[PDB]
């Protein structure tokens, strides 16, 4: 399980953790949100987003 930072606000999506208040079970990778999710936070679409590894 990987972790993924909005490049806008800072959220960080955490596999581990999902977003169940959105729909999202704990453990879903980030490829497999819907197309159609956004940062809980500040809106953004899936495009920006980065995965936090090298
Ligand atoms: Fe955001």
């Given at each position: ?27 879903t990778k ?11 936070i ?7 987003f980065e995965k936090?590894?090298?």
């Amino acid at each position: 399980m990987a972790k993924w930072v909005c490049k806008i606000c800072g959220y960080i999506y955490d596999e581990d953790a999902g977003d169940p208040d959105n729909g999202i079970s704990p453990g879903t990778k980030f490829e497999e949100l819907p197309d159609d999710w956004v940062c809980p936070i500040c809106g953004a679409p899936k495009s920006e987003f980065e995965k936090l590894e090298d």
